[PDB]
């Protein structure tokens, strides 16, 4: 899971601000 206003970027495996 990611924090609110973030999504998981599978390719990098890190959370991303969307």
């Amino acid at each position, epitope marked *: 899971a990611c924090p609110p206003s973030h999504v998981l970027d599978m390719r*990098s*495996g890190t959370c991303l601000a969307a």
Partner: antibody, heavy 123, light 107 residues
Framework: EVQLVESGGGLVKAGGSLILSCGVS????????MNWVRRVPGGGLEWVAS????????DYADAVKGRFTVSRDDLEDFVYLQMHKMRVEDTAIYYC????????????????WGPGTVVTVSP | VVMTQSPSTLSASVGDTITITCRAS??????LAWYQQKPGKAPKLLIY???TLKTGVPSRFSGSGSGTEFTLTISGLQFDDFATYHC?????????FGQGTRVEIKR
């Protein structure tokens, strides 16, 4: 080298509470996302909860969300796990583990684990 | 994302080359790890990023895969290798684990 050690485990009656804590040796936690993982009598592992560096985000498994709380103490190198409204299915060996590796990167596995603390909940 | 480890129990002999497969419910890239665990002990990290061997881990272990299918291979089992093996997907701040595979001596 790198070590973790859990304490707090024991017997609890259903609905009761138990607090767990995890101390470390030979590294500083402030550099790592810390995790709680448990081994069920079934044999397999469940990821329980995580807490991000400097507490920005705390994450829980669906089975424990609303009942568990994870905290961290960066200055004295401690991680805590609060367990409330405890159920029979929360009976497990509890491990704390760090997210890291030889060369720290953006997405690391759990490279270091404490020996585990036994938690058992009576029906 | 749900990991489906297979099988639950593997019966083998000393010196055999065996393989455990982990199945993903959706594409995972290469964000998989393999762990060994002996009864009443902490899980030990073996392989990560699907195929990277953690230094110190004996070279008879190897992993491979991408997307949904992953495989762990022990080339020539030793007595030391009889334990439980756990697959794990890790991303963001979460992690998820498979059922586990117990490797036992055949008779």
């Amino acid at each position: 080298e790198v070590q973790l050690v859990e304490s707090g485990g024991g017997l609890v009656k259903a609905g009761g509470s138990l607090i767990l804590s995890c101390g470390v040796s030979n590294f500083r936690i402030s550099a790592h996302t810390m995790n709680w993982v448990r081994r069920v009598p079934g044999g397999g592992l469940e990821w329980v909860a995580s807490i991000s560096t400097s507490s920005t985000y705390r994450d829980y498994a669906d089975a424990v969300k609303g009942r568990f709380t994870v905290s961290r103490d960066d200055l004295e190198d401690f991680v805590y796990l609060q367990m409330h409204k405890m159920r029979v299915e929360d009976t497990a060996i509890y491990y704390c583990a760090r997210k890291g590796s030889d060369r720290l990167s953006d997405n690391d596995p759990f490279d270091a684990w404490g020996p585990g603390t036994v938690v058992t909940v009576s029906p | 994302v749900v990991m489906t480890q297979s099988p639950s129990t593997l019966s083998a002999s000393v010196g055999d080359t065996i393989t455990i497969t982990c199945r993903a419910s959706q594409s995972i890239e290469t964000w998989l790890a393999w762990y060994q665990q002996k009864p009443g002990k902490a899980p030990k990290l073996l392989i990560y990023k699907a195929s990277t061997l953690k230094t110190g881990v004996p070279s008879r272990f190897s992993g491979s895969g991408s997307g949904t299918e992953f495989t762990l291979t022990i080339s020539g089992l030793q007595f030391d290798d009889f334990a439980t093996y756990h697959c794990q997907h890790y991303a963001g701040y979460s992690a998820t684990f498979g059922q586990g595979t117990r490797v036992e001596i055949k008779r």
